[PDB]
């Protein structure tokens, strides 16, 4: 039972957010809500607020917020920058609060192909900012975590993992060093009969548990990759992660940023793009906010015999009720 208190402060952080997207040139996007899916293979629907009513069926891994976006990008225009609200459906017998749309999706949607690090670099400035507009974020330790969906996969090439094995290992990785997750639990986890990746399969995963700024990092990937043919398969995914970190730079972002090889949040909706995490940066980690570039996704399940603009999209999901109202 909350006091008037909480419902006044879950409204100004709703209007700080608001702001922020306002003063970054960002306009307002239909909300929409996530209903998920009664059966494994059944799809996820989205229902946008907008101008129809528009409901879009959703293929059925897509389980996750941000497929709101892709909804909207499916539905027809969407504006170049563009911040969003929703939710996902929780039956109200079960806990659910329908009228609080406690999500909020940020996105750049282009349609030229020349400056998609740029506008990566641009959501990581828009996150910077909101996390110096809250007491919450602003007074503790915060950090960056980049990874890229092609870096994941070619890791997983050389561990010699199985695909269809691979989304499971993703969602297990997606946990790493988060709220004590630690790499044994995620051995565990990874060895387990439900996932079944050998035991060296993990040993040679075990080799990319670890973060580092982005130069170090580059040379310590491509000194793992020395001497197998993933040495030059590498190189244009690094190089894409050093052109984000150089605009970054450029876009004065203040917090850190590290390269994470294992990112893995969400990779399935991200393929293959960069992702990148915002997270408390403390003993025990947290995730604070996630994204990553979804063109992939676009350009799978766009509306097949008929041409179309291509439009690529990067953008982050952030549950704001969560985060930065309930404090």
């Given at each position: 039972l909350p006091t008037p208190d909480d419902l006044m402060r879950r409204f100004i952080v709703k209007d700080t957010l608001i702001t922020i997207f306002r003063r970054h040139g960002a306009v307002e996007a239909p909300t929409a809500t996530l209903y998920p899916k009664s059966s494994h293979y059944g799809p996820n629907a989205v229902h946008l607020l907008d101008r129809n009513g528009t409901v879009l069926q959703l293929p059925f891994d897509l389980v996750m917020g941000h497929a709101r976006s892709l909804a909207r990008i499916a539905s027809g225009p969407v504006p170049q920058r563009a911040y969003s609200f929703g939710n996902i459906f929780r039956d109200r017998q079960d806990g659910g609060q329908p009228d609080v749309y406690g999500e909020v999706d940020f996105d750049i949607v282009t349609t030229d192909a020349m400056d998609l690090a740029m506008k990566e670099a641009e959501v990581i400035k828009v996150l910077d900012e909101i996390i110096a507009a809250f007491p919450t974020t602003s007074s503790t330790p915060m950090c960056f975590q980049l990874g890229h969906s092609d870096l994941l996969q070619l890791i997983f090439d050389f561990c010699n993992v199985e695909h269809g094995a691979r989304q499971a290992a993703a969602e297990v990785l997606s946990?790493?060093?988060?709220?004590?997750?630690?790499w044994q639990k995620v051995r565990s986890e990874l060895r387990s009969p439900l996932v079944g990746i050998s035991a060296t399969s993990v040993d040679e995963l075990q080799r990319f548990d670890w973060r580092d700024t982005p130069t170090k990092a580059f040379t310590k990937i491509r000194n793992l990759f020395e001497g197998t043919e993933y040495y030059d398969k590498v190189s244009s995914t690094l190089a894409h992660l050093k052109e984000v970190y150089e605009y970054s730079k450029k876009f004065k972002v203040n917090t850190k940023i590290y390269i994470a090889p294992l990112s893995s949040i969400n990779e399935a909706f991200f393929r293959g793009g960069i992702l990148f995490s915002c997270l408390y940066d403390r003993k025990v980690m947290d995730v604070f906010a996630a994204g990553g570039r979804y063109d992939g996704l676009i350009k799978a399940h766009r509306p097949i015999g008929s041409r179309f603009e291509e439009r690529h999209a990067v953008g982050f999901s952030l549950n704001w009720e969560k985060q930065l109202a309930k404090p």
């Open positions: 946990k790493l060093n988060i709220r004590n997750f630690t």
